Amino acid sequence: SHTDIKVPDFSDYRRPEVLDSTKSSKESSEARKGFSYLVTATTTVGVAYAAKNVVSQFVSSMSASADVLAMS
Amino acid sequence: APTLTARLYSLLFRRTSTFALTIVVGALFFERAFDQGADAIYEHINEGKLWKHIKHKYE
């Protein structure tokens, strides 16, 4: 039958916060999301710091150089 | 009990609207924090050798 199909054990791959199969995940869910989405946000902040500097440097080359500012 | 990271999720970045406001403001602060720190680290690494260290000398 198709009722012979049970889902294999993911206890190896699971997080610690959802291992107890007698426990409602909802209390941990917000923490589990908050952890992963923090990584993403921290990455975006770190790139945003870089991107700002890279762009600003190219913009500054297009601006007035040292030798023109000197003899102005 | 509301946890550490869940408390961030719940109020700070559940919505994608506030997600960005957090990133922007966090990046605004991070820039000041990191630059200042890494400047000071580089300046302590290279103590006395840069102009700002020997500027009082000739001024």
């Binding site: 945003a48 762009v55 | 406001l21 922007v24």
Partner: peptide, 22 residues
């Protein structure tokens, strides 16, 4: 109706941005 707090929050997100690079 419902996009007023969202568009205000995105209005803030965009605003600080122009402060972000400049």
């Amino acid at each position: 109706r419902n996009w007023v707090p969202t568009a205000q929050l995105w209005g803030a997100v965009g605003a600080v941005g122009l402060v972000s690079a400049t």
